[PDB]
């Protein structure tokens, strides 16, 4: 639910200082985009479902 997501939050919030030694930031941000997109899809579907 959030136990593996708050870790990603803190991991991005710690890796804002180096910002170039870690190339894996982009895939993590793509998964943030996926989570935001799925959340918006679910909110529209909950608006239609009611």
């Amino acid at each position: 639910s959030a136990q593996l997501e708050q870790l990603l939050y803190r991991y991005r919030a710690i890796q804002n200082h180096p910002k170039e030694n870690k190339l894996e930031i982009k895939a993590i941000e793509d998964t943030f985009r996926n989570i935001s997109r799925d959340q918006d899809i679910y909110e529209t579907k909950l608006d239609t479902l009611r």
Partner: peptide, 15 residues
Amino acid sequence: IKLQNLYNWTPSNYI
């Protein structure tokens, strides 16, 4: 990347 559509998150809404 939004903000309130990113803290409100379950596995019950990924599908």
